[PDB]
């Protein structure tokens, strides 16, 4: 309805820790970061959907910020302020940025990202980019439509895993930004496994890197775990 119509950019900002930069005394670093995110939230323009602990997912990445705003300029500004004006940003390196812009789906305008639906973020997440085969969009539309319907049917064993599938064209190297949120990580793993049993898998060119981690309740929890 109005949710298909609305303008929202989404960014997954993945950061890596620099060994030795952070130190051991961190209470004031914690206090300053929560203040930063507190200030963002009151300002009403950038919505932080989650801060995630990616420890142990992959080499060269440690945490991720998922934030959302009507204007990309607002994400640019928050991204820069975080890096420039928080100790946490000063001591971390940008590892990967996953940018996207919400649009109505092609065939099923009732398919909406969970964050657009305003659903509570899930405790666990996996994020990755996606690139379709070269022939996918110029394919006969009703064949693409059937494949996507079969794709959809294969997912409804996972109503507890909420999908965010968002266009990413010209916001980086990719066609789509994908994010799956669930109460338990094993359901995200099983969903990806089951979704291999679909004809849509014949129309895939890229889907890495993956970022998977745990949504923290409090930035305290992330800071205290990073390498010093």
């Amino acid at each position: 309805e109005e949710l298909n119509s609305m303008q929202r950019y989404s960014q997954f900002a993945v950061f890596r820790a620099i060994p030795g930069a952070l130190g051991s005394d961190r209470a004031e670093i914690v206090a300053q970061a929560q203040s930063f995110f507190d200030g963002l939230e009151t300002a009403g323009k950038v919505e932080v959907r989650g801060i995630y602990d990616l420890a142990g997912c992959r080499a060269e990445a440690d945490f991720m910020i998922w934030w959302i705003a009507e204007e990309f300029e607002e994400i640019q500004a928050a991204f820069a302020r975080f890096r420039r004006e928080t100790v946490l940003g000063q001591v971390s390196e940008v590892a990967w940025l996953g940018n996207s812009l919400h649009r109505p789906a092609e065939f099923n305008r009732s398919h909406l990202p969970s964050f657009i639906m305003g659903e509570i973020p899930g405790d666990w997440i996996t994020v990755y980019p996606f690139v379709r085969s070269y022939d996918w969009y110029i394919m006969d539309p009703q064949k693409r439509r059937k494949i996507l319907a079969e794709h959809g049917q294969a997912a409804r064993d996972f109503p507890d895993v909420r999908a965010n599938t968002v266009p990413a064209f010209a916001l980086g190297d990719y066609e789509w930004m994908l994010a799956f949120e669930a109460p338990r990580l094993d359901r995200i793993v099983d969903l990806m496994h089951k979704m291999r049993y679909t004809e849509a898998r014949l129309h895939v060119r890229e889907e890495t890197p993956f970022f998977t981690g745990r949504r923290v309740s409090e930035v305290s929890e992330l800071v205290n775990v990073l390498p010093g």
Copy 2:
């Protein structure tokens, strides 16, 4: 004045830089003054024209800003590029992430298709830049068939006259066949154009189209330098 614009010799370079963490610091006043005077010197020398400086913040890891400049001779871009790196602290505290070089040529079939910069159009507020490589079979394809595919490609862009194209040969100036830049008043227009252009036969004749660089044109070297991470 189409035939004269088509025969013009103009090289175009997108110079993408990344800021070295820790190199800029808190005292950037002289860096900006020194960088502004470099770009002022470029204007008065009157041979390398800067179409824009762009803030790429938030686009990708490992790129922060980009210079788009144009010259009749590539050796003049070489001199300007080398001078920026060697004789300004901004160039000294930055590293080169990627260079996209190109030389304007007439289009193969439609000689009214010319780059926005060649037409002297005002540059757009937002830009996306990326290289391009066609399929191996694209150029030996029957020319009537390639002509028809390119005409359908163009028609697919009918709803986006506010997105101005710069499609420019890049052979032998790097690893690529074409340099592409799309300029628009708002970023969402570029995203929506790219998505719509997937719905074309031309898409079956592509090999490479990354890395992408997307950002915002700044009015002043001042505005860019003060965004950068220290």
Copy 3:
């Protein structure tokens, strides 16, 4: 039985460890002894990867019922032990044990609680795009003939575990054996299978020798 398994591969930073390693070893052994105490994360092995590949030197194989327990242990190792502070993370191979598609007898060696092999080869795996939608009894048949191809190698123990969404891959594989040459020969014979026609990725490989305690590993490192 639910288990997450992680292969955490580290690279030694030459210059970072010195040859005052005695304190570093004792501190690292204390970390590991404490993990054993807590009873959540089981270390199957520490492995000397010296000479396998550039940019890797050692690997930890540990296992837990919940992934956040591994995140905590991995993070504590890098945060609270000098060995972790002076080492770089090279690569992480994560996986979650799931019952096999057709033959429910095929269980990973670590799930059976078998003794770990002296030698190990670990690598990630990605099947062809068409593998899972292939006709099912066709895939069953290929997988059975593939299993039959390892009959001469009962001393090599398999660990084939799903890795979907825990990184960039579909499966994590780990083969354990008393002699490295048995792993080499098993891999070679496994090439003679129809399954090889349905592969997209299988690197990087990490091959190495299981050590007795941390000291035996730390004393090898370039440091």
Copy 4:
């Protein structure tokens, strides 16, 4: 028919270096003088022939200059390359980016096709260098069909006699099958030649052709050293 030039043994190396920012500094006159003495020492020993030194500034990220030198025995190039890195300050403040090695051989079909440097032609003011790898099926193709494709490929270059070709085997001297270098008075003629050569059937039998290195042949070391970042 060109027996002697086809028979001779010459190794050819393109050595591409990157400037290490911060290493070279502001004091360059003696670095220049020492580098010219190294190069004059090479001329006088008569084993290694320096065909050109090239300013690559602005071509690609992470490359800055290139030495093209030639010698009858590869160990002579190895020694000069090592001596440059070891015993000149310029070599000590530069980083090796890429090396393209080749060995001259007669052409498969047209024994009149010989590299520009083998024919003793004067080197061109502008150059593009890149490696090449053919399709897996190329060499086993029926020879008369490969010969026809290569004849048509040569015909496609006929309007560019000013762009001189160097197509040289590279098998086992690195990761590639051929080392290609095109030299010309004008960079724009190299771009146009590369564009035109896409219009051949040989393009259907290609696996790799990057990285590209493109730049301007200098007259003297001074012109290069003075543009590098300090």
Copy 5:
């Protein structure tokens, strides 16, 4: 079947490629040389790791400078020697590991007279090129009669190069590759010409990966190599 003992022998083979660290060696290298020579003397004396060659790779490729080719009955013996070189000699401490190619000798699938130069005890070549190799996915499951034919044509294609000595050694599970390849010859131009001629074989339709290449010159003594490196 005149080679059954050599076919059954167990020998691992590693190509260890190093990169010099600019500014680390300095210009007085006499002590580093003597220390390195001592390290290699110790290996010869201990009798477990055979050094077949040390090679000057200057000018072959960016990011590599020299290579050690050594061989042992047990991989742990190479592991120890590799670690000790890095840990206990300044030359190993001032160099970076660029690349490692590991392999384990096995009888050939069809022609059991085809054995590596190093297994046959042949004098190592003055010039070498080393690279890893990965066949097409369909290579091993293909009908054996077909693979036999292709491999027989492949060996025949090398007929004019008896002076180029092959080492085609399984590398499965010792790294990212299927084979480790090394060709040794008295003249580098002979390796270039062999490699070019070997493109004219059906086997090339069954290739997936064959880089990086390391090509260089065998040095008589450690002194010769160290003196070449950047200070």
